[PDB]
Ligand SMILES: N[C@H]1CC[C@@H](N2C[C@@H](O)CCN3/C(=N/S(=O)(=O)c4ccc(O)c(c4)C2=O)Sc2c(Cl)ccc(O)c23)CC1
């Protein structure tokens with residue numbers, strides 16, 4: 430059965446865990462139980478093809494970690510998450526994308542840019558800005574809300590499709 434190794438990356442507090450737990454449990458994370466870095470398995474059918482998603486929800490990029498090179502080597506597709514209320518989280522996408530491409534020694538790595546927390550009025554990153562950046566990178570851009578569940582499935586399944594298209598190259 431086809432297996433896809435997906436990695437959710439981004440700055441601290443952008444909602445990497447909340448997006449992952451929404452896909453896995455259909456439930457929004459509680460602040461009184463913070464999610465620890467872990468992987469999750471979920472079998473889904475996308476465009477009539479069955480597959481197993483193995484998703485690694487990573488710690489914030491500024492948090493301490495010894496597994497970044499290994500997850501970037503193993504990862505087949507990356508969900509590059511920023512939060513729409515955090516300009517640094519958006520600007521730092523540059524750094525994460527560059528590190529993934531460096532580790533994987535590839536200019537073409539399946540990626541989706543995700544602007545999370547779309548429910549928040551306190552927006553500091555405009556949709557158009559992030560759209561244009563994604564066009565420059567040649568990747569899809571999706572705004573999501575882990576809180577409201579808006580576009581969460583779309584974000585992950587779009588990434589699977591990007592990996593499928595990459596495997597066809
Ligand atoms: N649940 C326990 C045991 C497992 C611990 N892990 C996470 C481990 O499952 C991840 C396996 N793994 C990977 N293993 S790994 O050695 O690189 C690793 C990276 C980060 C981790 O937190 C762990 C392992 C780990 O300790 S890479 C990877 C990708 Cl790219 C996608 C999906 C994956 O499942 C995946 C967390 C605590």
Ligand SMILES: Nc1nc2c(ncn2[C@@H]2O[C@H](COP(=O)(O)OP(=O)(O)NP(=O)(O)O)[C@@H](O)[C@H]2O)c(=O)[nH]1
Nearest residue numbers: 440441442443444445446447488489546574575576
């Ligand atoms: N309003 C709103 N808050 C969200 C959303 N997603 C996550 N949060 C909030 O953001 C905070 C951090 O969420 P979490 O998912 O743990 O972020 P993370 O990116 O996984 N954090 P860490 O880098 O430490 O692993 C929590 O207070 C959570 O409730 C969202 O879409 N909307």
Ligand SMILES: [Co+2]
Nearest residue numbers: 523524527528
């Ligand atoms: Co750079």
Ligand SMILES: [Mg+2]
Nearest residue numbers: 445446464487
């Ligand atoms: Mg987290």
